[PDB]
Amino acid sequence: KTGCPEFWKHPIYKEFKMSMPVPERRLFEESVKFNAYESERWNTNLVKIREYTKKDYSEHISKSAKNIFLASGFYKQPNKNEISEGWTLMVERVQDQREISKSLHDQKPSIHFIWGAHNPGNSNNATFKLILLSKSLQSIKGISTYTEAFKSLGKMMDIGDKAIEYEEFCMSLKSKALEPKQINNALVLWEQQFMINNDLIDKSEKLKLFKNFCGIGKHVSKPKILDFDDANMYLASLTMMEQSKKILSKSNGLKPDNFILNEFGSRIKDANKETYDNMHKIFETGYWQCISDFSTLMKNILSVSQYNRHNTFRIAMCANNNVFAIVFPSADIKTKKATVVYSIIVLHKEEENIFNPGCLHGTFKCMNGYISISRAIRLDKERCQRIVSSPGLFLTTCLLFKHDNPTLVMSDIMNFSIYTSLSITKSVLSLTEPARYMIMNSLAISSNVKDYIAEKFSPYTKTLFSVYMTRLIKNACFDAYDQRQRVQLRDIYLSDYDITQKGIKDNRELTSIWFPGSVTLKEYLTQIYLPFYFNAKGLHEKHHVMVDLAKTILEIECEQRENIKEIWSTNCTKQTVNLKILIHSLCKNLLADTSRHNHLRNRIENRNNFRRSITTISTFTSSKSCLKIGDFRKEMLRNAMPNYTDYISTKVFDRLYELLDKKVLTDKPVIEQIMDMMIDHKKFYFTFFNKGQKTSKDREIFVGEYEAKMCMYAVERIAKERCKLNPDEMISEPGDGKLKVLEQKSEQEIRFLVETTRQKNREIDEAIEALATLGKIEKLSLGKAKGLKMEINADMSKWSAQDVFYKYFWLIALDPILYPQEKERILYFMCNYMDKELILPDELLFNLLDQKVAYQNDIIATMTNQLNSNTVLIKRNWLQGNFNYTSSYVHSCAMSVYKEILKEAITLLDGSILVNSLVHSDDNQTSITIVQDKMENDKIIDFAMKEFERACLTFGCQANMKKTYVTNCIKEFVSLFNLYGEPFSIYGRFLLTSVGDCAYIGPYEDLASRISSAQTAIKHGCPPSLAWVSIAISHWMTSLTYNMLPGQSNDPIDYFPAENRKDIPIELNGVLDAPLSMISTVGLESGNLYFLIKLLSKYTPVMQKRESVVNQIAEVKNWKVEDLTDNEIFRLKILRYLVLDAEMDPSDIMGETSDMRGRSILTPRKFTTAGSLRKLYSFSKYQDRLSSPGGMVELFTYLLEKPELLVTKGEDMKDYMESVIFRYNSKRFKESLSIQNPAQLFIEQILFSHKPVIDFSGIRDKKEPDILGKVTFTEAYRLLMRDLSSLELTNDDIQVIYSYIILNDPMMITIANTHILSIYGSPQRRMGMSCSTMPEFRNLKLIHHSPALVLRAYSKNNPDIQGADPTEMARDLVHLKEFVENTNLEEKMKVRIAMNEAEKGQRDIVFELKEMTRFYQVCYEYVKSTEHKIKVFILPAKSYTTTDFCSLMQGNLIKDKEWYTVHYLKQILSSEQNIAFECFKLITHFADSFIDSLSRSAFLQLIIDEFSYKDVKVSKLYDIIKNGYNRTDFIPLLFRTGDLRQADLDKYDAMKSHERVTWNDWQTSRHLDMGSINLTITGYNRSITIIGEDNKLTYAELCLTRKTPENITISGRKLLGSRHGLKFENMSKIQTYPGNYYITYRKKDRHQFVYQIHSHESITRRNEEHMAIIYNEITPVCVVNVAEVDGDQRILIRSLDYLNNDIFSLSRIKVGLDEFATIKKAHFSKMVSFEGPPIKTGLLDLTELMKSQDLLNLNYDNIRNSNLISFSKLICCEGSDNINDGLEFLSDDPMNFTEGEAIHSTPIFNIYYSKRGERHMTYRNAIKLLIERETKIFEEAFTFSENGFISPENLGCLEAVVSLIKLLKTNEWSTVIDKCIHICLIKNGMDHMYHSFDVPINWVMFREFINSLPGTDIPPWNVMTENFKKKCIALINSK
RNA sequence: ACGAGUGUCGUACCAAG
RNA sequence: CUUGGUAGUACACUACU
Ligand SMILES: Nc1ncnc2c1ncn2[C@@H]1O[C@H](COP(=O)(O)OP(=O)(O)OP(=O)(O)O)[C@@H](O)[C@H]1O
């Protein structure tokens, strides 16, 4: 209500205004006090401000536009010389900043492991291996510094011949659970653990070894890195790599048998045999053995390192009987920052057979071979996790790099993979992070690679492999610019509505970066971007990274303090803003934006709950961290500084609770509270920490106060809705819809570039081709306009740091949706935010207070007054991520200014330009297409980049040097690529993130996260086989982490009534069984769906086996629970009582909400950090209330009386407090507030493998470590199985399960129908990859609103909830209530409640509360399982309907080499007048295009009286359109049927009141101006007709009633003003002659034209006077013949029959002599919705052709070049001998065919379009030629003999194959073969012996003849026959 | 030795003799 | 240097849903 008068007192505002010109200060002042409600209009102030700055904006825009003439065309090209200069400068800077060491022995270990081949001779028994190690260590020959101590270690570990009592002692120690019991000169304490015997080791030797070799108790320069550019160092690195290649690439001499193979080999092989072969090769080599041995050894070292001593060491072993590791004494691994010290020892027979990655200490000659000992290695928990998880990462990297590349050798790939996966140091991060940007910029057309390399790039090479990688990067950067010219665009196949073919040609020419070989462009980009994602997180030590981040922030703030004086500049000064240009841009942008939508303020108040309560906003009541400023002494640093500000970090909701309890916040609506807080809170404090990402330099992250949180939330929500950003998307996790937005933009520029050049060069290329039947050609070719495409992928440098915060002041002051008081208070907040202070973390203060020796130039000391305080003022740096949307809006305004610059600049050259630019937080992608003829392209590019940099500097921004590059066909938005219209993404980045990043929450949590990552990768276009690889690796890693491998601790095979992990649900620690399509589309629920589908297939009669899923489910009533296998009963009980019911709680639920129950049953307990909880103010209140006489039961009663507090976490202050206190009882919500370190969660599963962790309590109440449950995994399985055996299974429960897992959600029904009814078709190659969502996804969504809102409405029983539409909640709640009533949930809940109460005698609040909690949780999960977040997919084609989407998706996920066509037997998808219109616009045009004229009417009548469309009968739709008054749109239909009336013709003539625009024929392509132009525009007493061909309008016939030139011109002007749609500008000019009238066109606006009719004298006279004085002149186009017709011309029904005696069309009839009645076309992708009885004509089936989508093209070339699989789809002869009968009914009209025309642009590409064919180009002729080719192709392909196809010897093989196909059940590739055979025998005239087949039963014969038959090479039959053979052999093996 | 680093660190801690 | 005793998180973590 009242404003903030304190705003005009602020020192920040005082500085802001004095920095501005006096008139600008005034205009700002009147801008602040402007009220949009109290003035005449809402734009008076904005219009005034825009007009004030109009002159200066025009001056700047013109000055920047005229700079295209001052360009020179010499931009930044990163060729070899520039790269070399940058490399030299970088070397100089690095040698300055580092201490370069040229010694080879100063290398750090590249891999902290030395390996040797396992000995086939020695045994694998632990004691024998220990004896061997001892004896070999004792016999060391030679002398060194530690040889004596090593031999003493050998002495003190021998046991002699006392092994039996040794193993007895060890076994007894293990059985009982410390005293050293000496065996033989060895004080054994445990298995493989020994006590240091001072009698066997010298004192000096022991002390020296323990202090120097291991550094145990032994306790300024520059970092010492190796010489990366030295010749000797690079040669040594090459020798190391070559030695590793030589030794590790030898075969293991084993048999690969592991979990991954035995579980997923069939799937991976049936998706790609190559991938299976690659895995089989990898598993046989020494690389996999080495990595597995190292991982197992590391696991053993971590396991045994718990209870050590100060003189004890351990001998950890592994599966390799030649590799041992000594675990030297250290701290307990499960402690804080605990390290482990070890030393690898290898015993090998012969020297140089040792893996030395720079870690070997020395190899010595012992008895019977050599012994090799590595150096001591000290590692922490995090790097140990990476070491353990390395095998999966290595396998994934190998299969990503080798996938589909015959020109890359596996050994080199595996060398790189092993040296990159086991590297746990920053040395490789410092190269992987910059290499991406460096190589991408280097390949670019224009970029700053030289500058980036020279003054930013800094390799950090402490290892030899780092030197190798640096050399590889140098070579790749040298070669990128000289190989950029090897990419070529693909031939574009566009059809004026879609681009069928687009992208980069698959030319494998580009040289591989890391490998010897050649790669394609996509593979090259993968190799560039893939190495970024191997890097580990949390490698930064806080001790150094914290001071690094502090140095960065403090240095930037010091620079801003002492170097930036002026804020507003006009010469693009860095970190300055052009004031007037900014003001004008804000005016224009706000005025444009506030015009599209009207209720903008209403949307702000509604979508952000500004009028609601504080407790209803998720961002204010979450579990995140906040900041508290105050005194926390109770909860050396304090008594050091008198200005030290105390602080603590708490949770968001806890701070909200504290604020509510202390009356700081009230129950007023949130916006009022925030508005008061804008003036109440005047000091803002922020604290920073390290994010811990994988980049070489970490990023600072700032935590703020809750008051700052509310106040910034207000501003961000005000500015967010003005942006064009989707409000359901994440800034942190950008949605995949951008990948489609990029594609749409690329298509738009592609169409613009294709059309504009053609339009401007038609006459030039015509003059050229006329001379082709010489220098004139060169002159014409130089005189034409050429095309250009540019895309500037840029990122802004210091988006949050180096920005002018003063521009947001103007942005707020110009916002008209805000009252003067609101602007006052928001500006007061902005001023106070400019005065925020950064509090240094106390860890940093401790680090800096232990210095003593002072830093030479300590900036922190200088601006903390020698650490007098810990607070630093930060003025111009708005903190990272606090102002995303406002900065995005300002960036969009800047880009609008840049677009204006480019548009004016190009109009200065009389060209055409089209610019689109996407603006995210700071990432940029601007696409520019320019067509002109004035200057060269290089000058255009130079000017574009110069003005781009200037525009960014204009608004205080600054583009990065590292991330800004320009390209001709590579668009790069946020982690997404668009390769010339074809979308592209690096799918491997998700697989690597799934393999590396693991939260270790539990088995299902990790498995679900990894499967979700695999699903996302599939959605990003991952090949199916590699997705199976990732899924298998996820399974194997999850099973290895929790000891689930067969024979381990928690293996559940022997505890469940199953036989394999396959038959066990993943919810109970099984493996997932589902085709990849279900995984991609649903995720984590595909197992249940697949099990139900398998149940249906197993237990459905054969009569309904091929029907829909609903039809087979209808038979579930006939099912019996008795005749079910125990496994199926087990899984059905699981589904009934754990998915659809809450019979067993995974954990104690008392205190839980409805949304905190997962899909898991056995959730292991996690860390409950007691220390973290004591920091919470509300936790003390919870403790006090718990320790009360009757406090808790009263709270339980209050919750029971208001059950809505379970779903809704609180909606008011009192209710929110009670709900928080209640939730503190969850025993799992306390885990979410605790510290869950992935390191200790990792070590938990290895250290404590038998500790009970699972908190399982059965069916509905039937000193210790921090992590402790009640039962172990084995006990959990046993108890759960016992409990499940106590329930009963009835057929009604099965019906309920099938009704509420499949039948409820339409998406589940659709997926089941696709899985059951799928028919696989012709193989095709991926050439037109395109993004697409699933169309009409509103109709397949069962619950429209969010599950949380639905449950809130259900709890309140109110459909009209605060934030949702009541109309949809009506249906949502009725669905939820129907679910509740049908499953018998509420009444059963009351049954147990009453039964328990009666048993106990009195009411028990706890049991009822638990029951209600289970009820709400089950309802919430049911609603949640309905929504399937199907985001955009990357499909081989474009999808128009749901069935098309499903078919494309299923065909894209069955093979890696090619994608197939999928057809469905029935309708998988199982305003009414609109359906009728679509029904007839299809069938009419279908008959005209594809049906002969003779049979057209008969086919139409058959469809009308027998077919049905979209489950509606066609007859009903025709009756509907008859009743409607829009029948005049279907005049040809009514005439052909006979239902036309004279009233219809009167109405048709009555459509002359508004000029009746009728297109007598459809243009072949109207945008490219192709097709016979036959147009008629008529009004009352006037009509015209236009005829032309593509470019030239032949003649126009005009009929009028009064032949006077004035009336002629007026009538022509009226007619041309109609919505004819014809451009009249693309048409070429025509010669003008006296005495004739010519069609003329004018340009008036920039893109608006006016067409009139004039005379030769008039046009000449006006041209000759206008040419004298841009230049808009009268251009004639077509001559007109004026005629006089006074007649009524009343169209009568009697005339139509006579007129149409020769036209048999169904979509066009001669309503007059020169005018036609037409039916609007409809796309044939929807043609599948029809369903009816088959139409058998001869041998073909029209109804199947109605379904065969691949044959619905109207292009002659596509049909003639098809495959015979389409005919196998069509054919249903049932006893025919000739094919000519069927071909008669097909059409014989001319059909379109393809032509190519080169496009003149810097990316050279050729487009292929459609054009009208000649007389012989008909559908029937294409059919005949296709048959004549493909029948012979198949016959030779399947000859299986020499005599011929018809020879009986071949007929025997055909009989065998058809018998195999028929006896064995039908497969996914069996019908096509047998129908192809039928077609070919029809062709050979031996159809009598196709229905005469029989059997030739032993499967040995079947196996033999299938295996031995040859496979064809040239025909497309190769792949399909291979698939058929593989499937049939697999199935007969299953037999 | 190893991790980190052009920021002084980790490189287990305490008590007894 | 010998003996005894002690040790569960990096107490860690944002804005954007
Ligand atoms: N994890 C995050 N936390 C907070 N804000 C983030 C985060 N990730 C992205 N952002 C937002 O997006 C921007 C991305 O900036 P980016 O990481 O490119 O660095 P920058 O500040 O632009 O500096 P430079 O380009 O020199 O690295 C941030 O400034 C912030 O607005």
Ligand SMILES: [Zn+2]
């Ligand atoms: Zn037949």
